[PDB]
Design an enzyme around this catalytic site. Sequence first.
Site, PDB file in Angstrom:
ATOM      1  N   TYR A  61       0.880  -1.198   0.000  1.00 10.61           N
ATOM      2  CA  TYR A  61       0.000   0.000   0.000  1.00 10.61           C
ATOM      3  C   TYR A  61       0.906   1.233   0.000  1.00 10.61           C
ATOM      4  O   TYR A  61       1.989   1.176   0.638  1.00 10.61           O
ATOM      5  CB  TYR A  61      -0.930  -0.038   1.215  1.00 10.61           C
ATOM      6  CG  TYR A  61      -1.902  -1.193   1.243  1.00 10.61           C
ATOM      7  CD1 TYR A  61      -3.037  -1.173   0.439  1.00 10.61           C
ATOM      8  CD2 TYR A  61      -1.719  -2.284   2.079  1.00 10.61           C
ATOM      9  CE1 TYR A  61      -3.948  -2.214   0.435  1.00 10.61           C
ATOM     10  CE2 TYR A  61      -2.626  -3.335   2.097  1.00 10.61           C
ATOM     11  CZ  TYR A  61      -3.741  -3.297   1.272  1.00 10.61           C
ATOM     12  OH  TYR A  61      -4.657  -4.304   1.256  1.00 10.61           O
ATOM     13  N   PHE A  72      -1.512  -7.431   1.963  1.00 10.65           N
ATOM     14  CA  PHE A  72      -2.979  -7.243   2.152  1.00 10.65           C
ATOM     15  C   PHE A  72      -3.306  -6.582   3.490  1.00 10.65           C
ATOM     16  O   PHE A  72      -4.252  -5.807   3.535  1.00 10.65           O
ATOM     17  CB  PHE A  72      -3.735  -8.557   1.951  1.00 10.65           C
ATOM     18  CG  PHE A  72      -3.619  -9.054   0.535  1.00 10.65           C
ATOM     19  CD1 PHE A  72      -4.140  -8.318  -0.518  1.00 10.65           C
ATOM     20  CD2 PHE A  72      -2.935 -10.222   0.241  1.00 10.65           C
ATOM     21  CE1 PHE A  72      -4.016  -8.763  -1.824  1.00 10.65           C
ATOM     22  CE2 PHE A  72      -2.824 -10.674  -1.068  1.00 10.65           C
ATOM     23  CZ  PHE A  72      -3.370  -9.948  -2.095  1.00 10.65           C
ATOM     24  N   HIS A 180      -8.469 -12.210  -8.615  1.00 12.83           N
ATOM     25  CA  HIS A 180      -8.086 -11.301  -7.504  1.00 12.83           C
ATOM     26  C   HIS A 180      -9.322 -10.974  -6.666  1.00 12.83           C
ATOM     27  O   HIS A 180     -10.436 -10.909  -7.180  1.00 12.83           O
ATOM     28  CB  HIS A 180      -7.376 -10.051  -8.044  1.00 12.83           C
ATOM     29  CG  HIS A 180      -6.465  -9.394  -7.061  1.00 12.83           C
ATOM     30  ND1 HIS A 180      -6.877  -8.385  -6.229  1.00 12.83           N
ATOM     31  CD2 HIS A 180      -5.163  -9.609  -6.768  1.00 12.83           C
ATOM     32  CE1 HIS A 180      -5.871  -8.004  -5.464  1.00 12.83           C
ATOM     33  NE2 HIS A 180      -4.800  -8.738  -5.772  1.00 12.83           N
TER      34      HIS A 180
END
Lengths: 215, 86
Positions: A61, A72, A180
């Site tokens: 991120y 994640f 995904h």
Amino acid sequence: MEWSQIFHDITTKHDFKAMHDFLEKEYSTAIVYPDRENIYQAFDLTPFENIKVVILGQDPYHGPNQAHGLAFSVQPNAKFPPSLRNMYKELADDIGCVRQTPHLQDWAREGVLLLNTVLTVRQGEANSHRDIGWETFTDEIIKAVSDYKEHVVFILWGKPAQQKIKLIDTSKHCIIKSVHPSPLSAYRGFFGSKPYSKANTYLESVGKSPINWCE
Amino acid sequence: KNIEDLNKFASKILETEISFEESITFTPDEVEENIGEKPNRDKICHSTSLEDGRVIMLLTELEPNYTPWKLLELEEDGFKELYSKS
């Protein structure tokens, strides 16, 4: 077998000097995520010998208070990103439990190597640190996990992740692959995927304790 | 160019504050299986969940320029196009 030995063999076989110099200069002159001290967190919380499951991500991120060196996962008091929301939705539909935290440190401690293929990124710049050398490292990690471990679950979400089947001995190891969990792809096959039960069924089939996916 | 640019672009087209949380690279086959059109090049899907419960997805080209390509809102069975080059 210890990460220390695997990192040593990888750093003999490839020169990472140019990458470490670049990354030094990047942390000096830019916002780079995650914090320097968390780049390897997935390795710290999941020793080589505790790996039961590998889940591959792309890059960390790139927003503040998000990445902490796990695929994640975000920081405990941070907004739940869409892909995680869909992971959490399927987990509730699959195992039964509803996760209240978006932190995946408990997964890592259970034996889930939450390995991003690329371990750093400049703020707001998706893929900024793609192919500075992180894939050379990560590929060798994935190769090492396949070569030295006996029966591991690789969970591969989307095609970029599924390209790593090349590195996996699919006769020794379990491969759970699906589209995904991003909201672009999730409704076209991720819901009803049941990666979490499928992983646990395979681990019990080879005498390994299930992963506690819940909190 | 960076996420600020894409947040501004997408905020203009929706007339509320958009902040993209994640960026996932998809292959052309993958874009095809999800929206019907098969691009010639990799796309990055920048996604967010809003307070009103809406899920917004901006597809862009790769780094370094992340030029927009399509903007989409999530519906029960499919997507709603809110911007397209074609």
